[PDB]
Tab-separated table of N, CA and C in Angstrom:
chain	number	residue	atom	x	y	z
U	731	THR	N	316.295	135.773	-24.899
U	731	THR	CA	316.137	135.834	-25.652
U	731	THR	C	316.806	134.768	-26.559
U	732	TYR	N	317.848	133.450	-26.232
U	732	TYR	CA	317.985	133.012	-27.092
U	732	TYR	C	318.898	131.844	-25.674
U	733	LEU	N	318.850	130.663	-26.284
U	733	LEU	CA	319.484	129.273	-25.811
U	733	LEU	C	320.051	128.475	-27.020
U	734	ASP	N	321.517	128.362	-26.657
U	734	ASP	CA	322.367	127.868	-27.775
U	734	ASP	C	321.918	126.474	-28.277
U	735	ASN	N	320.736	125.328	-27.747
U	735	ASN	CA	320.833	124.339	-28.177
U	735	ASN	C	319.259	124.435	-28.782
U	736	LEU	N	319.330	123.877	-30.030
U	736	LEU	CA	317.705	124.023	-30.542
U	736	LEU	C	317.328	122.900	-31.939
U	737	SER	N	316.866	121.866	-31.886
U	737	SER	CA	317.003	120.986	-33.314
U	737	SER	C	315.807	120.460	-33.132
U	738	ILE	N	315.748	119.728	-35.154
U	738	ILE	CA	314.804	119.132	-35.688
U	738	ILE	C	314.953	117.919	-35.836
U	739	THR	N	314.932	116.928	-35.669
U	739	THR	CA	315.101	115.770	-36.121
U	739	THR	C	313.942	114.598	-37.056
U	740	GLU	N	314.193	113.162	-37.570
U	740	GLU	CA	313.329	112.948	-38.451
U	740	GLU	C	312.793	111.896	-38.045
U	741	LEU	N	312.780	111.087	-36.733
U	741	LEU	CA	312.144	109.575	-36.303
U	741	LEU	C	311.554	109.212	-36.875
U	742	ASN	N	312.134	108.472	-37.636
U	742	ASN	CA	311.289	107.811	-38.942
U	742	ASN	C	311.189	106.361	-38.224
U	743	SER	N	310.440	105.459	-39.796
U	743	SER	CA	309.685	104.475	-39.545
U	743	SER	C	308.438	104.980	-39.144
U	744	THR	N	307.692	105.889	-39.702
U	744	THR	CA	306.935	106.613	-39.299
U	744	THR	C	305.662	107.151	-40.689
U	745	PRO	N	305.428	106.413	-41.258
U	745	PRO	CA	304.601	106.923	-42.547
U	745	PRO	C	302.774	107.459	-41.605
U	746	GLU	N	302.049	108.039	-42.494
U	746	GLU	CA	300.727	107.680	-42.189
U	746	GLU	C	299.682	107.558	-42.848
U	747	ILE	N	299.632	107.533	-44.730
U	747	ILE	CA	298.650	106.871	-45.199
U	747	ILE	C	298.995	106.697	-46.573
U	748	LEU	N	298.578	105.664	-47.510
U	748	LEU	CA	298.832	105.189	-48.599
U	748	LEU	C	297.406	104.663	-49.411
U	749	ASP	N	297.235	104.967	-50.575
U	749	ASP	CA	296.137	104.234	-51.738
U	749	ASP	C	294.782	104.440	-51.371
U	750	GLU	N	294.337	105.631	-50.263
U	750	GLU	CA	293.571	106.192	-49.913
U	750	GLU	C	292.079	105.056	-50.077
U	751	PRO	N	291.523	104.127	-49.037
U	751	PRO	CA	290.790	103.350	-49.028
U	751	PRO	C	289.384	104.086	-49.106
U	752	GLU	N	288.613	103.812	-50.093
U	752	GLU	CA	287.335	104.388	-50.002
U	752	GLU	C	286.059	103.445	-49.476
U	753	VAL	N	285.129	103.638	-48.597
U	753	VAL	CA	284.581	103.104	-48.151
U	753	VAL	C	282.844	103.583	-48.287
U	754	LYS	N	282.362	104.614	-48.920
U	754	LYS	CA	281.166	105.493	-48.927
U	754	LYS	C	280.148	104.832	-49.958
U	755	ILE	N	279.051	104.632	-50.080
U	755	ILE	CA	278.160	104.053	-50.552
U	755	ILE	C	276.574	105.656	-49.928
U	756	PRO	N	275.477	106.076	-51.117
U	756	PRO	CA	274.547	106.680	-51.010
U	756	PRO	C	273.341	105.781	-51.114
U	757	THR	N	272.584	106.489	-50.175
U	757	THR	CA	270.848	105.763	-50.267
U	757	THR	C	270.083	106.305	-51.107
U	758	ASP	N	269.721	107.516	-50.692
U	758	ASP	CA	269.042	108.168	-51.990
U	758	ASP	C	267.501	107.917	-52.126
U	759	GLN	N	266.670	107.521	-50.953
U	759	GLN	CA	265.651	107.162	-51.008
U	759	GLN	C	264.749	107.813	-51.165
U	760	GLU	N	264.915	109.491	-51.487
U	760	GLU	CA	263.688	110.181	-52.161
U	760	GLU	C	263.573	110.235	-53.554
U	761	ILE	N	264.593	109.400	-54.010
U	761	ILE	CA	264.650	109.088	-55.701
U	761	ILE	C	263.478	107.925	-55.743
U	762	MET	N	263.732	107.202	-54.897
U	762	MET	CA	263.906	105.966	-54.402
U	762	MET	C	261.683	105.999	-54.701
U	763	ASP	N	261.315	107.078	-54.138
U	763	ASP	CA	260.016	107.465	-54.012
U	763	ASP	C	259.382	108.141	-55.270
U	764	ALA	N	260.172	108.129	-56.090
U	764	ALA	CA	259.953	109.622	-57.502
U	764	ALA	C	260.013	108.586	-58.467
U	765	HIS	N	259.407	107.588	-58.336
U	765	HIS	CA	259.188	106.760	-59.852
U	765	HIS	C	257.426	106.547	-60.052
U	766	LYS	N	257.022	107.320	-60.143
U	766	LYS	CA	255.279	107.490	-59.755
U	766	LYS	C	254.116	106.792	-61.392
U	767	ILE	N	255.237	107.328	-62.468
U	767	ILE	CA	254.633	106.620	-63.444
U	767	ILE	C	254.873	104.966	-63.404
U	768	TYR	N	253.857	104.251	-63.831
U	768	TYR	CA	253.815	102.999	-64.001
U	768	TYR	C	253.156	101.989	-64.700
U	769	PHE	N	252.549	100.934	-64.803
U	769	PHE	CA	251.731	100.120	-65.330
U	769	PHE	C	251.093	98.933	-64.558
U	770	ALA	N	249.722	98.922	-64.796
U	770	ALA	CA	249.702	97.284	-64.773
U	770	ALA	C	249.058	96.580	-65.217
U	771	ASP	N	249.178	94.502	-64.898
U	771	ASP	CA	248.893	93.935	-65.900
U	771	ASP	C	247.632	92.923	-65.565
U	772	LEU	N	246.681	93.204	-66.834
U	772	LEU	CA	245.512	92.789	-66.807
U	772	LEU	C	245.218	91.274	-67.252
U	773	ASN	N	244.120	90.962	-66.900
U	773	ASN	CA	243.739	89.597	-67.589
U	773	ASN	C	241.650	89.657	-67.561
U	774	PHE	N	241.451	89.116	-68.420
U	774	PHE	CA	239.649	89.433	-68.958
U	774	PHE	C	239.379	88.066	-68.754
U	775	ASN	N	238.437	87.987	-67.732
U	775	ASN	CA	237.587	86.446	-67.974
U	775	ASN	C	236.827	86.939	-68.925
U	776	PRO	N	236.528	85.898	-69.688
U	776	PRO	CA	235.086	85.810	-70.392
U	776	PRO	C	233.686	85.852	-69.736
U	777	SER	N	232.622	86.501	-69.615
U	777	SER	CA	232.000	86.225	-69.743
U	777	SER	C	231.208	87.114	-68.500
U	778	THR	N	232.235	87.879	-67.587
U	778	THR	CA	232.112	88.435	-66.591
U	778	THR	C	232.295	89.842	-66.845
U	779	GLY	N	232.033	90.718	-65.338
U	779	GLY	CA	232.067	92.172	-65.731
U	779	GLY	C	233.235	92.808	-65.310
B	731	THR	N	140.754	105.678	-66.062
B	731	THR	CA	141.494	104.523	-65.627
B	731	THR	C	141.786	103.456	-66.880
B	732	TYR	N	141.265	103.651	-67.683
B	732	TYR	CA	140.953	102.190	-69.019
B	732	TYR	C	140.665	103.116	-70.062
B	733	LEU	N	141.447	102.760	-71.376
B	733	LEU	CA	141.254	103.082	-72.602
B	733	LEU	C	141.321	101.871	-73.612
B	734	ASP	N	140.364	101.235	-73.917
B	734	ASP	CA	140.442	99.954	-74.511
B	734	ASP	C	141.208	99.229	-75.588
B	735	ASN	N	142.120	100.369	-75.911
B	735	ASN	CA	142.790	100.330	-77.489
B	735	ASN	C	144.457	100.435	-76.884
B	736	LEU	N	145.474	99.212	-76.915
B	736	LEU	CA	146.399	99.287	-76.803
B	736	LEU	C	147.022	97.750	-76.987
B	737	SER	N	148.368	97.998	-77.647
B	737	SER	CA	148.698	97.376	-78.327
B	737	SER	C	150.198	97.155	-78.332
B	738	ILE	N	151.110	96.002	-78.700
B	738	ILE	CA	152.870	95.708	-79.088
B	738	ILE	C	152.890	94.699	-80.051
B	739	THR	N	153.747	95.329	-80.755
B	739	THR	CA	153.886	94.913	-82.321
B	739	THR	C	155.359	94.583	-82.342
B	740	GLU	N	155.495	94.260	-83.712
B	740	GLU	CA	157.086	93.402	-83.931
B	740	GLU	C	157.901	94.264	-84.451
B	741	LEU	N	157.975	95.282	-85.251
B	741	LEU	CA	158.839	95.787	-86.290
B	741	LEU	C	160.215	95.123	-87.017
B	742	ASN	N	159.764	93.861	-87.532
B	742	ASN	CA	160.709	93.620	-87.786
B	742	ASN	C	161.778	93.803	-88.874
B	743	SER	N	162.808	93.263	-89.258
B	743	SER	CA	163.985	93.561	-90.153
B	743	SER	C	164.758	94.466	-89.035
B	744	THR	N	164.844	94.176	-87.854
B	744	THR	CA	165.859	95.037	-86.782
B	744	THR	C	166.981	94.041	-86.184
B	745	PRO	N	167.616	93.386	-86.520
B	745	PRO	CA	168.381	92.832	-85.499
B	745	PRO	C	169.075	93.842	-84.951
B	746	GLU	N	169.766	93.237	-83.394
B	746	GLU	CA	171.390	94.449	-82.720
B	746	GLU	C	172.355	93.976	-83.145
B	747	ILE	N	173.165	93.046	-83.026
B	747	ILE	CA	174.376	92.780	-83.259
B	747	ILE	C	174.453	91.458	-82.933
B	748	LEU	N	175.638	90.631	-83.718
B	748	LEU	CA	176.094	89.480	-84.002
B	748	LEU	C	177.314	89.209	-83.666
B	749	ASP	N	178.229	87.982	-83.242
B	749	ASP	CA	180.153	87.790	-83.201
B	749	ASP	C	180.625	88.064	-82.320
B	750	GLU	N	179.987	89.745	-82.099
B	750	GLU	CA	181.318	90.077	-80.656
B	750	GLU	C	182.600	90.666	-81.303
B	751	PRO	N	182.322	91.633	-82.387
B	751	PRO	CA	183.813	92.172	-82.598
B	751	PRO	C	184.631	92.800	-81.071
B	752	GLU	N	186.207	91.872	-81.435
B	752	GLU	CA	186.985	92.497	-80.264
B	752	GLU	C	188.005	93.245	-81.065
B	753	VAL	N	188.777	94.099	-80.314
B	753	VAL	CA	189.527	95.617	-80.905
B	753	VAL	C	190.451	95.711	-80.188
B	754	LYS	N	190.518	95.321	-78.383
B	754	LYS	CA	191.290	96.184	-77.759
B	754	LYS	C	192.604	95.464	-77.428
B	755	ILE	N	193.560	96.030	-76.762
B	755	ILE	CA	194.820	95.826	-76.994
B	755	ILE	C	194.777	96.512	-75.466
B	756	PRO	N	196.646	95.717	-74.660
B	756	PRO	CA	197.229	96.478	-73.708
B	756	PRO	C	198.537	96.907	-74.410
B	757	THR	N	198.671	97.949	-73.207
B	757	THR	CA	199.777	98.513	-73.396
B	757	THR	C	200.952	98.547	-72.169
B	758	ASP	N	200.907	98.417	-71.291
B	758	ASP	CA	201.909	97.875	-70.200
B	758	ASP	C	203.455	98.255	-70.231
B	759	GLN	N	203.519	99.528	-70.634
B	759	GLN	CA	204.884	100.451	-70.408
B	759	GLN	C	205.189	100.074	-68.564
B	760	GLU	N	204.685	99.711	-67.962
B	760	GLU	CA	205.319	99.919	-66.377
B	760	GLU	C	206.270	98.215	-66.576
B	761	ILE	N	205.351	97.417	-66.749
B	761	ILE	CA	206.325	96.041	-66.320
B	761	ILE	C	207.478	96.289	-67.588
B	762	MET	N	207.479	97.124	-69.245
B	762	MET	CA	208.857	97.441	-69.864
B	762	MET	C	209.699	98.357	-69.450
B	763	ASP	N	209.391	98.616	-68.311
B	763	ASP	CA	210.315	99.361	-67.264
B	763	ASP	C	211.008	97.983	-66.322
B	764	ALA	N	209.825	97.096	-66.048
B	764	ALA	CA	210.408	96.426	-65.237
B	764	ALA	C	210.977	95.040	-65.755
B	765	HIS	N	212.862	94.926	-65.991
B	765	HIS	CA	213.478	94.159	-66.758
B	765	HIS	C	215.088	94.657	-66.532
B	766	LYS	N	215.341	95.293	-64.932
B	766	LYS	CA	216.150	95.757	-64.604
B	766	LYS	C	217.431	94.734	-64.843
B	767	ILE	N	217.027	93.318	-64.571
B	767	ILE	CA	218.324	92.362	-64.943
B	767	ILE	C	218.987	92.658	-66.372
B	768	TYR	N	220.185	92.830	-66.433
B	768	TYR	CA	220.961	92.645	-67.942
B	768	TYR	C	222.148	92.487	-67.324
B	769	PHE	N	222.834	92.230	-68.807
B	769	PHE	CA	224.278	91.749	-69.085
B	769	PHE	C	224.828	92.356	-70.338
B	770	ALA	N	226.303	93.002	-70.181
B	770	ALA	CA	226.183	93.477	-71.325
B	770	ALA	C	227.969	92.663	-71.831
B	771	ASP	N	227.725	92.783	-73.074
B	771	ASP	CA	228.886	92.146	-74.090
B	771	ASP	C	230.165	92.807	-74.241
B	772	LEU	N	231.500	92.410	-73.605
B	772	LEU	CA	232.629	92.750	-73.772
B	772	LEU	C	233.647	92.471	-74.381
B	773	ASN	N	235.154	93.225	-74.820
B	773	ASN	CA	235.814	92.532	-75.694
B	773	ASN	C	237.157	93.569	-75.082
B	774	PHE	N	238.144	92.238	-74.825
B	774	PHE	CA	239.587	93.049	-74.556
B	774	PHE	C	240.442	93.145	-75.695
B	775	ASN	N	241.149	94.305	-75.848
B	775	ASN	CA	242.211	94.361	-76.087
B	775	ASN	C	243.466	94.243	-75.798
B	776	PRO	N	244.546	93.578	-76.360
B	776	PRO	CA	245.494	92.961	-75.460
B	776	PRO	C	246.349	94.213	-75.328
B	777	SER	N	247.199	94.404	-74.449
B	777	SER	CA	247.987	95.203	-73.874
B	777	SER	C	247.632	97.088	-73.827
B	778	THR	N	246.512	96.911	-73.413
B	778	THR	CA	245.505	97.898	-73.267
B	778	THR	C	245.103	97.879	-71.836
B	779	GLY	N	244.502	98.951	-71.315
B	779	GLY	CA	244.079	98.913	-69.625
B	779	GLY	C	242.908	99.181	-69.501
């Protein structure tokens, strides 16, 4: 039922993390196919067809 | 075999024709379909397609 020596102690010089370093980036290639509206630049030579 | 009166005579004031009056014309509609070579005149509006 018991043993009369038990303890919980500090063990300092032990942090975990700070400042929350962020590295993530999206790619989103499907929206980069979803620009189907467009327009072309033309030039008309005279006396041609 | 014979009868001894027969003759051939003039009956003048009788001409037929002179000066050869010409009236003819060709139509030639098939050559008038045989001009398949052609060319069109164009105009280019700017900033259009």
